[PDB]
Amino acid sequence: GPQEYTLIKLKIHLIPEFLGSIVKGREVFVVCATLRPETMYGQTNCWILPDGEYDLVLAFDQVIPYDAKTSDGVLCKIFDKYEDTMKECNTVYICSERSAYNMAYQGIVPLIHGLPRIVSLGKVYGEQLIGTPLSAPMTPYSLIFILPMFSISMEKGTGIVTSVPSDSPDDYAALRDIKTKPLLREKYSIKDEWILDPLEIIEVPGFGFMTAELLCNQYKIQSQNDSAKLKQAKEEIYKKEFYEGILIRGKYSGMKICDAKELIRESLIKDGYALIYLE
Amino acid sequence: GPQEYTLIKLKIHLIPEFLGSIVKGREVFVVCATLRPETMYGQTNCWILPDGEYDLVLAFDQVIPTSDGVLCKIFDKYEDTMKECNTVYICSERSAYNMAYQGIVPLIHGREQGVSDKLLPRIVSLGKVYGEQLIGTPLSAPMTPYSLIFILPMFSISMEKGTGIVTSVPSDSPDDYAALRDIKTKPLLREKYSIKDEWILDPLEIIEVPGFGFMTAELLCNQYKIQSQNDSAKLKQAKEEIYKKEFYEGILIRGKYSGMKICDAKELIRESLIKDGYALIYLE
Ligand SMILES: CCC[C@H](N)C(=O)N[C@@H]1[C@H](O)[C@@H](CO)O[C@H]1n1cnc2c(N)ncnc21
Ligand SMILES: CCC[C@H](N)C(=O)N[C@@H]1[C@H](O)[C@@H](CO)O[C@H]1n1cnc2c(N)ncnc21
Ligand SMILES: [K+]
């Protein structure tokens, strides 16, 4: 059965020149599926697969919100032609085609009678979005950048992911690879100013405030591509932090993750910074 | 743009035996797309393609009676459908998807099979049947005075159009007249599909057309030298003359709007069929 994600919306702060005519002064969001909305205080950057192909998809300005935990289905919405969508759709999401169809079949983006089709304004490689500044929710850094991550799967989520390197071993590893490998930075023209240090957001009694760093050392993870080791560190950190982790930032500071998580998810959804996304 | 049909509901009077367990506890309808709801007073039979494959499709009991978008519920599981759906429609799979995408039949959460795990909604099909196996099914059809009409074979049906199942008003459709005549004049065709004489009902006088009278379809078939339901070029012309002529000059002589011009009564008849639950608005 489907997994419930929180779809995090990250607004593009400066549209790249080459996308200007295509987005026609609509708001553009990069969207990222996460199981851990409580960690959004720690965002340092955003991650994209360089060779991955993403769509710029037309989306609803408003989505009908629902109690997914006490309901028997979900609604979608189909139009005759593109021009009919324009009253309700002035928002663009960057995401994989795969995920855009999943979104269409739960009322996040429109379908049209084109077998029904999404409204794709164009395609882009992730490489072409590297260095794009994004306005991000909750993180006190506020403005963060898109960086390359090579371990991403285009078959999961949107193909674009948040980075919380304090409390995700994958994120820690990927960031450390960027910080320690000049040739990688040279290859993708990564500017020094795009790289932000981890933030102390979660206290784990025993481990302190950089649990992901300690777990990377405990499993001797050397790169973002040590998948076997990273898979284990990821599952341990999730269990370790869901029970023992105390938030030390934001409205629910001093609470445990298990107690605050749902409240944070609600808040994100009511403020418009995130959506419920099932795939 | 898409054209606005009226989807007519023909209630199955007695379910064919082989489908009885499948549709137990549910009202079953054959559904037919028509541009001519005003002619349902003259229904003599129903038409199906023998080789065609039709689905038994679970349907909403209630539907939402511009150029906005149209909502659609995708249900988590088959089971959830059950409470707002005790209705089955017989129709082509193609037409059922069209119906699903305008809120007429439920969709259910599904996935692309084998390689992919991507969300792909499905109609709730209860079974696939050939048209041949429904020949002779008795139907309770709206507006016609015939208490029962029957499903008969027609060979000129296109499976891409409407539901693949069509109404028969042989007094005012040249196609219907020609197909019915083929059955009435070919014993070997009746033997081939085991057609009983009591399934073959006569045209009903329903519309008076200046210069033609009450059997305009027969007179057009004579005029265009139509001898067979397969005379597609002649039939298409005849159909194009009869549509305009009847809309603006044809006078209804049956129903509540007897005495009125078709152009003045058609929408009122269509509203009434919809309110009474005998039909739905169907775009394709
Ligand atoms: C802990 C906060 C920061 C962290 N980065 C996070 O939220 N990761 C996503 C999520 O928490 C996890 C679920 O398995 O996988 C990640 N994920 C989602 N989509 C993908 C994808 N397409 N490819 C690889 N990983 C993914
Ligand atoms: C005058 C009433 C009786 C008349 N018989 C009627 O209602 N015909 C349908 C409709 O009015 C017409 C639209 O062109 O095609 C017919 N039609 C609908 N579906 C199909 C199909 N699948 N194949 C061939 N014709 C079709
Ligand atoms: K009747």
Automatic annotation (TrEMBL), chain B:
Recorded superkingdom: Eukaryota
Sequence similarity: Belongs to the class-I aminoacyl-tRNA synthetase family.
Protein name, per record: leucine--tRNA ligase
Coverage span on the entire protein: 254 to 541 of 1128
